[PDB]
Amino acid sequence: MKELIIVGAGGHGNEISWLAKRCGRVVRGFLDNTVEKQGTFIRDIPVLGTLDECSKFTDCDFVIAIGSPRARKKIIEHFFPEGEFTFATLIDPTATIGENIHIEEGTMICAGGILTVDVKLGKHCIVNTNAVLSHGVILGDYVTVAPNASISGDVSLGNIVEIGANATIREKVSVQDGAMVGMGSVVIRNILSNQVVVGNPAKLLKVIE
Amino acid sequence: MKELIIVGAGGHGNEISWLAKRCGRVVRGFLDNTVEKQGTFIRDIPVLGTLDECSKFTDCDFVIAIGSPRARKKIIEHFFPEGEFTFATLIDPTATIGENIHIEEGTMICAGGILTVDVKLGKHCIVNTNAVLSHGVILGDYVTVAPNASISGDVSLGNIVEIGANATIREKVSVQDGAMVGMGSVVIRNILSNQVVVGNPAKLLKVIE
Amino acid sequence: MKELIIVGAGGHGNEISWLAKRCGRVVRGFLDNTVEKQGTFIRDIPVLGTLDECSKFTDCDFVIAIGSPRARKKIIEHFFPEGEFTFATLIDPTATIGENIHIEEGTMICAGGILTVDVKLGKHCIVNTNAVLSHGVILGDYVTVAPNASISGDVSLGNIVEIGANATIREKVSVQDGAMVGMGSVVIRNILSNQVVVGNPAKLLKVIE
Ligand code: NA
Numbered sequence: 001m002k003e004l005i006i007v008g009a010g011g012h013g014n015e016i017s018w019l020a021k022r023c024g025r026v027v028r029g030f031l032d033n034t035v036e037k038q039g040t041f042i043r044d045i046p047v048l049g050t051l052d053e054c055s056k057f058t059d060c061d062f063v064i065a066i067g068s069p070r071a072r073k074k075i076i077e078h079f080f081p082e083g084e085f086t087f088a089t090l091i092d093p094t095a096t097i098g099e100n101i102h103i104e105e106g107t108m109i110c111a112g113g114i115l116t117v118d119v120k121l122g123k124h125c126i127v128n129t130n131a132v133l134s135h136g137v138i139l140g141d142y143v144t145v146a147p148n149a150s151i152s153g154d155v156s157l158g159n160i161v162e163i164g165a166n167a168t169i170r171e172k173v174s175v176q177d178g179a180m181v182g183m184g185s186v187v188i189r190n191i192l193s194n195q196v197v198v199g200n201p202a203k204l205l206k207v208i209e
Numbered sequence: 210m211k212e213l214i215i216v217g218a219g220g221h222g223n224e225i226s227w228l229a230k231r232c233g234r235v236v237r238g239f240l241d242n243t244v245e246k247q248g249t250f251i252r253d254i255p256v257l258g259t260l261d262e263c264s265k266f267t268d269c270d271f272v273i274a275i276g277s278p279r280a281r282k283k284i285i286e287h288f289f290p291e292g293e294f295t296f297a298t299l300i301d302p303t304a305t306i307g308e309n310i311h312i313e314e315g316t317m318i319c320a321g322g323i324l325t326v327d328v329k330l331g332k333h334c335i336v337n338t339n340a341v342l343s344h345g346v347i348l349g350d351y352v353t354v355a356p357n358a359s360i361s362g363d364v365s366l367g368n369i370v371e372i373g374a375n376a377t378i379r380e381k382v383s384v385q386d387g388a389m390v391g392m393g394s395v396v397i398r399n400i401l402s403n404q405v406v407v408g409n410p411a412k413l414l415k416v417i418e
Numbered sequence: 419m420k421e422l423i424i425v426g427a428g429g430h431g432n433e434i435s436w437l438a439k440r441c442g443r444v445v446r447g448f449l450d451n452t453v454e455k456q457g458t459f460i461r462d463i464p465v466l467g468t469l470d471e472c473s474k475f476t477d478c479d480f481v482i483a484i485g486s487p488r489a490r491k492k493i494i495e496h497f498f499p500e501g502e503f504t505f506a507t508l509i510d511p512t513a514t515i516g517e518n519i520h521i522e523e524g525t526m527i528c529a530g531g532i533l534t535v536d537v538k539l540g541k542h543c544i545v546n547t548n549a550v551l552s553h554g555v556i557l558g559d560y561v562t563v564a565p566n567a568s569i570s571g572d573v574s575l576g577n578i579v580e581i582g583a584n585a586t587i588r589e590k591v592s593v594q595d596g597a598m599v600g601m602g603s604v605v606i607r608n609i610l611s612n613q614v615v616v617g618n619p620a621k622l623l624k625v626i627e
Pocket residue numbers: 122141
């Protein structure tokens with residue numbers, strides 16, 4: 001397979017370099033805009049330069065290993081014009097991927113994640129450690145599902161949605177584009193665009209836009 | 210082994226047909242009373258007819274793949290007189306079944322479920338995806354444990370109990386017959402018969418009967 | 419390897435005898451101070467005597483299979499003077515141990531636990547069933563992490579901390595020595611020494627000392 005460039009050398013990039021190694025991929029290096037990270041390494045993998053160096057690595061697959069949905073969308077739209085680059089899809093060997101699962105490119109399915117049946121993910125999604133997506137779940141593009149999230153049957157998550165760690169979503173709930181569910185939330189009602197909800201049961205905290 | 214008939218062609222039946230395939234079982238088909246589902250399929254497995262056709266398949270094992278505890282009890286008592294039918298016990302290959310685990314027939318233990326030591330389940334139980342039953346847990350008949358439920362040591366769940374997704378039950382709690390714990394609940398007190406409790410900490414919402 | 423002595427023949431000792439068997443270890447027996455447990459067994463493994471018999475088994479590895487952090491510290495300081503005894507480190511075969519994970523002796527990592535990258539544990543820790551410790555997590559000595567706990571990146575847990583079942587800790591939170599997080603808590607703020615916090619979001623309940 002192509003060597004991999006990981007965009008983002010933070011905590012998620014750290015864990016995605018681990019995922020890539022477990023997937024048998026050779027990581028060429030990271031791109032990252034942080035001044036303090038130039039000339040640094042994670043486990044023998046160098047930070048190669050800033051994101052505008054991506055054009056020097058068109059021979060590589062990319063992945064955008066940054067948790068923020070809006071960060072991944074911003075980076076793809078600025079640095080990765082349609083058709084110019086290829087993206088990896090990384091699925092941990094300990095993830096369970098069942099039947100009629102469709103995953104678009106750039107997606108990361110991490111250790112212990114479970115996608116059962118009839119699940120559809122858009123591009124550049126994250127399903128983090130030990131999260132569960134049950135029957136009929138649909139994710140748009142740039143969705144982040146944090147560790148231990150519990151997403152019941154027939155849930156729909158719009159584009160640039162973030163589901164926080166160990167949150168629980170009732171079956172048949174819809175979450176509109178850009179919303180965010182706080183860690184630990186218990187979501188029993190539909191969520192509107194750009195809403196942040198928190199708590200048990202989840203209630204509106206604020207709007208992100 | 211015998212071919213399997215799955216009663217219920219809904220979301221749970223979808224996931225239990227997946228479980229059966231992962232268990233190496235041949236699924237003859239589903240029985241389901243929904244008019245709109247007659248002549249339909251899930252992943253090449255047909256809906257054969259309504260539940261009163263069960264008598265045409267006594268050569269098959271059955272499983273009642275319906276989440277509602279009371280639905281499974283109703284169906285067994287009406288359609289499955291004692292001794293006339295055999296029931297499968299389906300344990301996902303990725304479930305962990307430890308030592309001195311006793312599971313009665315009709316039970317479904319799904320992907321990533323963990324039953325550690327000295328756990329006892331009655332007939333027609335569900336332990337859904339990634340749920341954990343720790344030391345000394347006892348379940349009656351027709352218990353449903355939803356995905357990611359966290360059932361601590363020495364918990365007793367009566368007949369026709371339902372524990373919702375990603376709920377947490379304190380060690381040594383007893384839950385009487387027919388009760389239901391909402392998704393995400395934090396249960397730190399005993400629960401009486403037919404009570405619905407929700408929240409953190411769990412409190413009485415209403416009675417189911 | 420050396421035969422193992424398990425200190426504590428309660429619920430945790432039950433599950434740790436299971437862990438030891440899954441790890442290929444021969445358990446010589448338990449030590450336990452309970453009068454009613456003298457002459458008893460768990461799955462063919464005898465309670466050998468009280469903790470003051472430890473000096474008769476210096477040929478064995480020990481593990482202190484008691485959930486209470488303060489119980490493990492008390493027992494080590496009274497019965498196990500520095501250098502006189504050796505301690506096992508038990509890691510379930512179904513635990514995922516990633517890269518740059520450092521675990522000190524006496525630690526138990528149970529079934530389905532996940533430690534991703536750059537995680538450090540002190541002595542006599544417990545990571546119970548299906549718990550997740552993400553990038554950069556640090557635990558002191560005698561930390562207990564209960565089943566299904568969700569500990570996000572860069573969390574620091576002091577000595578003798580207990581994190582209850584299915585609790586969730588926000589990234590970069592620090593928990594000072596001796597604190598306890600109730601089961602199911604949603605921890606979004608730093609915790610001070612000896613504080614007990616509960617709820618969603620977690621709030622101070624009381625002080626343990
Ligand atoms: Na699309």
